[PDB]
Structure formats: C-alpha cells, structure tokens
RNA sequence: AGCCCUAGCACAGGUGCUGCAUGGCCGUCGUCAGCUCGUGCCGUGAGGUGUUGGGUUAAGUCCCGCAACGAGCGCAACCCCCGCCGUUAGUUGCCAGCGGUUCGGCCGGGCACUCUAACGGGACUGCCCGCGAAAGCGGGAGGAAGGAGGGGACGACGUCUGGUCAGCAUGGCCCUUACGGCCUGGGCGACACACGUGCUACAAUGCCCACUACAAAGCGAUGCCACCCGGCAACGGGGAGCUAAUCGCAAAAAGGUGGGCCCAGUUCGGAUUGGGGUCUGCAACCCGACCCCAUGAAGCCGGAAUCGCUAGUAAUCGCGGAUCAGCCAUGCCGCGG
C-alpha cells in the first residue's frame, strides 16, 4: 500500500498528487 | 500491582443484548482500534448462527464460552534445584479472560474465508463440544493432572 | 463604525489599554460595538537543551500574539479628543481601518 | 533532467568551437564536469578532472548525450 | 547538571522582559539585533557606572533604554558632558534618534548582578574567596533581604584542580514561582582562567 | 415548546433543542441513520430517552460540530440529557443512576519530547 | 575556520543559493531560526534572560 | 584630514592540542525522599541526637510519641494546558424566533447557543455511616469533577576526574610565505562485511476503483494559491482573494455505502532496473526530489535473545510545523480520529 507510488495510498503517504491521485 | 488489588475495568453493556460479556469477546476481536468492523462480525455472525441453528445467538455464545472455561491450570515456580510447574485453580476473572480470548484464537486458524463464518462455527463448534478452542482448554486441564504430583506447593 | 485593530504580544496590557479606548470612546462618544478577542496566534520553538548531543530532554517557547478587536459608531471628532495624543501602551501595535 | 537548455559551461565550447575552425587539440583539459556534452563535438579528447587528476577520454557519438563526469569516476576499486 | 534560570523560570509573573516591544516576523530579527548592540556598546562603556538592567522599550523611533546603576554620576559627569555623547553614540550607528532615560538603586547590595559583580572583581585582585562569598552574603543579608545565595565556579584561588564553593542564609526558594528572586551571573577573567559566579536574592510574594 | 441542553465529548459539541412529538431527529440538515449511517453505536447517543421513557414522543433538531462521529455521539447523548432534565428538573434523580450527566474528561493526552508517542518510549539496545 | 567564514556568510555570493544563515553571536552554521539569526543555543540563552520579547516558558 | 593602493612594523588568524587547567550549558542516578544547619543534650574523640520508633502518605506527607526545639535546600503549593459553571465583549456563530433565499448563514435582523479569550466561581476531607488516640484508610450522597480529577513546567546535598575547547567564553601549549586565507573540482554519499534506530510489507478484521462536512492545532503578501485553460500526471499558462476567526495550503485518513479481486508470491508486497518527462537551482555524473510507462525482487509473520505500554494509555490513521531554493524526512516537535 503504502510505497506502490501507483495507489492512491501510496500517493496521500507519499504526500503528492498525480494521475492514481489527483486534486478534484 | 505492587500496591493496590487492580479495580476489574467495568464494561459498557452491549448495544444490544445489554450483556457486558458480549461487548468483552466484542474488544478481543477487534484489531487496530475498530470496533465497528468489529462488532459488525461478532454479530453478522450471530446472523450465520440463526440460519444454520434454531437457536438464540446470545445462549449459544454464552454457553460456547462456559464450555471454554479452564477449571485448573498450571503456573510455573521454581526453588533451589530447578523449575516445576503446580497446577493451581482458575478463578473466575482469568477463566473469562482465557476463554474469550482463546475463541477468537482458536476461530482465526480455521479455513473459511471470513471472519464472520470463523467466528460463527468456532462459536458453534464449542458449543456442541469439539472446538479446537475446546482442544486448548482440555489441554490445560490435562497438563495439569500429569503434574498433580506438584500440588503440594500452592502459592 | 470605526475598525481599529490591536495586537500585542502581552496579555494583560490589551485588554487594559484597549479598554482605554472603550472609555475614551465612550465618555466622549456614544455606543459601542466592544472588545471582542480574535484568536491568538502561537509561534513555537522547540530546543535541545545542550550544546551538544542530548537529543532527548529540550525546551519549550512559545510567542503567543493575542489580538483584540475594537469598533465604534459615532464618527466624531469629539471622541478623537484622547484619541489625538493620551498614551499608555508600550509595545502595543494600532492598526486604525475605515 | 532539463530540457530548456543543456547547460553545458560556456568557456568549455569557446575552446571547442574555436578549436573547431581546424583545431585538432588533444592537451584539452577540464574541470567542467557539470557540462553535457553536445551534438559531434566529437573526435577531441578532454582530459576530465577527478578531484585529484584528469583524465584523457576520447569522446564517440552514441555518448553524446551523457555528462562529461561520467567517464571521469571519483574514487577507487569498484 | 540541571537546575533552571531562575529568571526565565519566572517571566509572566514575578519577573518582566528587559525589552516591552511589539514587532512582526521580518523586522523582530533586526529590532533584536539593534536592541541587543546597544547592550554590547552599554556594558562595554559603561561598565565602571555599574549596570544591572536596562529595559528598552520601542515604537516606531522612540527608545526607551532605562539604564539603571547605583552610580549615575558616570554616565553624567557633572552637568551633561558624557551622557550627552551616548545620546549620540547610540544614534551614531543606530540610524534612528534614540531617548535614554536614567535610573538609580536605591540598593546596590540587592542588584544580584552587582552583588555577583564585586565579588568577581575582588577575584581578579586575588582575593580571598570563601572570604567574600561570606561576606557578599552577609552584606546583602543586612540590605533587609529574607534569603540570598552565591556561588563560584572553579580554580578557586588559583588551583590545579576546578571547586565550587557556595553560601547561603535565610530562604531561597528556587521552587517557588512567587518568590521574586533576582539573579546575577559575573565572569572574572583572572590569569589562569575563568571562574563563574552565581547570586541569588530572594525578597517576597502574593 | 422547547428544551435545550450542551454537550460535549472530546473536541465535539452538541447543540440539542428537545420539542415533543412523533419522533423524528434532525443533525445538521440530515435524518440520525443517515449521518450516523451503518454506526453501530450511534443509537446509544439516544438512552436518555430510553431510560426515562422519553422514548420517542420527543422531537430533536441537533446540529454538532467538532470531532469525528463517535465523539459527537457521546456529545448528543449529553446534550440529550443536559435537555430533558431542564424540561423536568426532577429528570435527574433517575439519570444519577446511569450518569449520563458527565462530561467524560478523557481526552488526548500531550505527546512529550524524547518519547515518540506520549507514553510510546523509544527502543532500547543496551550492547 | 570560524571568522574568515563569519566575514563571508555576510558577503552578497556569486550565484543565488550559496546564501546560508548563521547565530548573529555565535556565528554559528546550524540549527538558526529564520525570526531570531540565532543559534539554537543563543536563544536559550536569552529567552531566560528575558531580552526575547513575549517569548514565554512553554507549558500544556 | 577621511579613506582607499605598494614596501615595511606592532598585530590579526587558526574548527591546531589540552573537557584531566576551566566558565557556561546539558546528560545521569532520579522527580528518587532524600541531603543539611542552628542551639541545646551525649561522647576523650571521629561522631551521635534532631532525621531512630509506631500509625500514615505519591513524599523527611502528615499524626502520635521522644533530650531535644526549630530552621534551610527538597516534597507539596503559588504558574501553564484540559474538564463543569458564571460575568464582560459581538465583520466567527443561527428560524433556537420570526420575512425575503439566485434555498450557499447570503441581506437586514439578533447574541440567546457553539465558538474565540480575559477575569472569576468551583473541591476543602466540607456532610451522613463505619474502624482509629490522632493523621487518616473503607464506604455512601450531593456534584461536570472526590480524595494528587488528567496532563505539563519545576530536577535537593552530591556521584560518574560523565559530555562539550566543534556553539560561545577561557588558562596554557603549538603553526604563524602556513596548522592562516581564496577559489575550482572531488569527499563527508565508498562497500566483502557487522550492529543500532526506523520504514514498507508478507495480505480477506485484506488490497483496488467509485461516491459520500466527521472537522479538533498550525503556517502563508520576494509567499499560501481558490478558479480557469493545456497536460494521462509532475507541472506550465492565466488570474481572483486575504498583512488573514474573513482568503489559501485543505484532501484530512482510518470510516460509511457501491462494485471489483477469491487465496494465489496473487488485483498481496513495490525492491531493482529500462525509458520518457516535470520542477528548484549558476549547475542534479559522482550526489536531488516529483510524475508517467514498462520491469516487477526478497518477503507466507521471523533462531537464541530482546523493546514499549496500566486508559483516551498501547495499538492503529491522517494532519501541521520548525530547518529549508530544492531534497534524499521513513527523522524530530506537535495535533487530533
């Protein structure tokens, strides 16, 4: 979970945003 | 507990049956602090415990347990030469306290898939008697006995 | 209505001086809209103790900036008469607004 | 990585370039290993530095992307 | 190796800031830096007066730098001559035109700072030290106080080996938070090294 | 007409307005098992009623705020009773028993330096 | 080299970034708050002098 | 004259050595119930008594006794945070009470309530029963809170010749065309190995996608960035708002509901590596983080050992800040579910 920067977990841990987790 | 005798923590009764002894084995199978996931098995089990027996859920839990209830253990004390283990009886708080717990123990090393169903015939098994929760209290009951020669000591 | 603002880093010397311009805008004046206290606005610092290596045991400061707020509905220059030049702050800050 | 420029040091293609109007150099040497190397600026030989010497790489093609301290290594056995 | 500052222990009651400004979080490091300057500049030149604090105020060009000394004829001369060159000295570098207040103590054997003070300065005229410890003591005992305390660091009396000798009567409660103790920490920096004295004077409370 | 009482339950506060009637209970522009949907506990924040025998002949409108929902739910359940003891002031000597008048002091404890957690103390290694 | 290297944190640098903070009497590298240009130990220092305005003994 | 430039002279400089020459500040036994003094009394004397004893306490806390009677540094208390109540105050908060609502607390209207923050009230062993000579221990009501209600700040005489000359200060000793100084590169980032502290995991009380105000501290006008458009995204155009209870970082996550995976090294786990990019910055090879595609490792709960924690604690899930262009933060300091 997470560190699969390709998961939505992976991103909000992660603290970024992106495609697997985008702002709205 | 070196200086007062431990108040027994009180329970807040079920939000259902009202029975404090629910919400306990509700606690021991809880995991990281979720007791609603929690609750939603111990009784989306009680539910498998209606379609498969006739029977109330709670007096089919209730006496599960009582069938899970050491009578006599064994602690370990040692002396002046090596260490031996007395079998010592098993009073009231701590038999809850193991049987409880050894159930949902017992329930997680069985093979359906979900915790629900796990819960629910471990539950069930021990209430007819042949629960692996049941093999480990016998056990106990058992491995005292073979040391029965010990319980001359008694602390 | 009259916005003048109050900040400070003092507690006591706010609501004292700040009702100072409850009294002086009273007296000479007319109804009041009082002193009502915005939140305070805490800075930390937290420090090791030593000079060296001791990572564990530090200390704790804070600079808590209290601000209080002030507004009055009589535009009139018979209320800017201790308004004009009657101090007792030290280190407070004025921010007057329209 | 970059990719408005390629933020190669200035005074290195000075020489290149002005090397490069019959200019056949090999005593070239460096210390810009922070510089990419650039379109067949080939043929030459930079002696790059290390930290403690430099060192004669004869540059190719199919390596023109790279950076010049990537052939100069820092350190010892590997 | 504990014990705080009882000084800092105490700020919000018992004891105030050496400093009632108000600023904001880009001018502050600055009004620090000046502020603290002007404290480097007094108590270099301005030493012999004899200094305990020296609040300061500001807002906007106006300074309150109420230097406080048991001797204010040093600062003066005998009509204006000195001060009137600090007023400047200080605006010298400071770009700002500077007031300057003048106090005095109506004790100096109750100014910790000054208590500690005189106590170094007799340790750079190789003095007897458990001597005036005893006496600093004894002195500040007999100002009125109702408990006081002092103390020195080490190479005491020029020694091999680094002490730390130490003297008190009546309360000196660093526990109590109503307690109003000043304190005053003097260097003494003698021929073979440095010793460190604490003072302590404790006066009342509700 | 009306009835009204506060509470709260760690960082979570209840505005609770009592009307008897029917049966219905608002929070924050929401029906009870649609804001406290799929909670198990959340009928819990109602034996007030059920002790006294309020039951349902009482209306509620509730807004809360603070918290996360199983704190307001202990937070209404005060509110609930801080209410209904201010409609029948002899509604107390009945919720003594079952104290459901008490503002539950138990809140996140500091975390402190050079622990990790509070009480959570750092790994020891010894050799 | 502590003075050679006090007399060049204040220096305007060639390039931007080679900026850094130092304790204005330490002249001291780390650990330098933004608010104060004062090491971590210079601060404690005067925060219990009382020569830190509003700067009070934290406690919750 | 001031000030700058060359040759000279005093002197600067040194993170060079000495923490066993030191100041200062910290760590430690240990928040342990202790360590002492004055006068008297005892003893040739070092010393003792006091402080031993019984009851009691979290406590040398009190009580009762006693050649002692008191006192200081301690303990506790005076301070801060959290709980309940009350005044003061209304550009945050609502029909709770009524009219318009483009149904958003948005417009008058209003501070009752929530909140924001100043000052107060409140708990003391006060009252009833029980044992006790007492202090006090077991209960019981009243009360938001009951016996230290919960959490902080606070660290006695002193020990470890504890730590630190590399934060600073300082005695001494040592270099003074170099043990000083400036730069450009390199190094502190090496890698057969070994341990500490952590992080992510080994999955079904689980992982993935979709949709759904639970809101409790903090930061931001050479910055936070709503909202637009382009882009799978990183991010780049454009541009509103707020010196900020008003605008923004803000999505809180665990959760609830829906669907999917069906026990598999898997839709578990994301290491390694190929490639293509974005951003900050003079400059990312050594040595940056972030996005996207492809790759998908070891790992099926861990020997002998051994760590933390007694209640809003442990466990678990996000949140912010400090440093800071950026970031190797999984660290640290805090916050709440």
């Not at chain 6, 500091?110 to 290694?125: L, T």
């Not at chain 7, 944190?9 to 330098?32: E, L, M």
Request: with cysteine.
């Amino acid at each position: 979970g997470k560190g699969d920067r390709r998961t939505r977990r992976g991103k909000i841990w992660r603290g970024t945003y992106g495609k697997y987790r985008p702002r709205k | 507990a070196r200086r007062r005798r431990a108040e027994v923590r009180q329970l807040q009764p079920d939000l259902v049956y009202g029975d404090v002894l629910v919400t306990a084995f509700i606690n021991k199978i809880m995991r990281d602090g979720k007791k609603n996931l929690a609750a939603r098995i111990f009784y989306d089990a009680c539910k498998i415990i209606q379609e498969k027996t006739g029977q109330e859920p709670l007096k089919v839990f209730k006496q599960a347990v009582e069938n899970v209830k050491p009578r006599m253990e064994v602690r370990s004390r040692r002396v002046g030469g090596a260490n031996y283990q007395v079998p010592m009886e098993v009073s009231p708080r701590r038999q809850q306290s193991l049987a409880l717990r050894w159930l949902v123990q017992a329930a997680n090393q069985r093979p359906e898939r979900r915790a629900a169903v796990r819960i629910a015939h471990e539950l069930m098994d021990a209430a007819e008697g042949k629960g692996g929760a049941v093999k480990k209290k016998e056990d106990v009951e058992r491995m005292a006995e073979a040391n029965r020669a010990y319980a001359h000591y008694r602390w | 209505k009259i916005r003048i603002k109050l900040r400070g880093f003092d507690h006591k010397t706010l609501d004292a001086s700040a009702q100072k311009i409850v009294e002086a805008a009273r007296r000479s004046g007319a109804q009041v809209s009082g002193p009502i206290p915005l939140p305070t606005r805490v800075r930390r610092f937290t420090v090791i103790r030593g000079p060296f290596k001791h990572k564990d045991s530090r200390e704790h400061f804070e600079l808590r900036t209290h601000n209080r707020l002030v507004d009055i509905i009589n535009p009139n220059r018979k209320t800017i008469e201790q308004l004009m030049t009657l101090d007792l702050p030290t280190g407070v800050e004025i921010e007057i607004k329209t | 990585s970059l990719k408005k420029g390629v933020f190669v040091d200035d005074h290195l293609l000075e020489k290149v370039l002005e090397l490069n109007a019959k200019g056949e150099k090999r005593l070239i040497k460096t210390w810009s290993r922070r510089s990419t190397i650039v379109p067949e600026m080939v043929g030459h030989t930079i002696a790059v530095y290390n930290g403690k010497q430099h060192v004669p790489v004869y540059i190719t093609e199919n390596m023109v992307g790279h950076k010049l301290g990537e052939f100069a290594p820092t350190r010892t056995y590997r | 190796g504990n014990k705080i500052h009882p000084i800092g222990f105490r700020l919000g009651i018992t004891r105030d800031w050496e400093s009632r400004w108000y600023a904001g979080k880009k001018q502050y490091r600055h009004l620090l830096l000046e502020d603290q300057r002007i404290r480097g500049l007094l108590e270099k030149e301005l030493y012999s007066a004899g200094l305990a604090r020296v609040d300061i105020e500001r807002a906007a060009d106006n300074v309150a730098v109420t230097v406080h000394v048991a001797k204010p004829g040093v600062v003066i001369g005998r009509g204006g001559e000195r001060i009137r060159v600090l007023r400047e000295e200080l605006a010298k570098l400071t770009g700002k035109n500077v007031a300057l207040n003048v106090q005095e103590v109506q004790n100096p054997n109750l100014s910790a700072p000054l208590v500690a003070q005189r106590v170094a300065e007799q340790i750079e005229r190789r003095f007897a030290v458990r001597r005036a410890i005893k006496q600093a003591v004894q002195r500040v005992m007999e100002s009125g106080a109702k408990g006081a305390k002092v103390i020195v660091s080490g190479r005491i009396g020029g020694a091999e080996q680094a002490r730390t000798e130490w003297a008190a009567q009546g309360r000196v409660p660093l526990h109590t938070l109503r307690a109003n103790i000043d304190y005053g920490f003097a260097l003494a920096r003698t021929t073979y090294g440095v010793l460190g004295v604490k003072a302590y004077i404790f006066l009342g409370e509700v | 007409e009306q009835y009204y009482g506060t509470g709260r339950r760690k960082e979570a506060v209840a505005r609770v307005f009592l009307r008897p009637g029917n049966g219905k209970v608002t929070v924050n522009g929401q029906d009870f098992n649609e804001y406290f949907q799929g909670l198990v506990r959340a009928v819990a924040a109602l034996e007030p009623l059920r002790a006294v025998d309020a039951l349902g002949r009482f209306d509620a409108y509730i807004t809360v705020r603070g918290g996360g929902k199983s704190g307001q739910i202990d937070a209404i359940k005060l509110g609930i009773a801080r209410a209904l003891v201010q409609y029948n002031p002899d509604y107390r000597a009945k919720l003594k028993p079952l104290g459901f008048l008490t503002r539950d002091a138990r809140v996140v404890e500091r975390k402190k330096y050079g622990k990790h957690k509070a009480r959570r103390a750092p790994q020891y290694s010894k050799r | 080299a502590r003075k050679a290297l006090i007399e060049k944190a204040k220096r305007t640098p060639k390039f931007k970034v080679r900026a850094y903070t130092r304790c204005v009497r330490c002249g001291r590298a780390r650990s330098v708050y933004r608010f104060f240009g004062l090491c971590r130990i210079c601060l404690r220092e005067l925060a219990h002098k009382g020569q830190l305005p509003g700067v009070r003994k934290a406690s919750w």
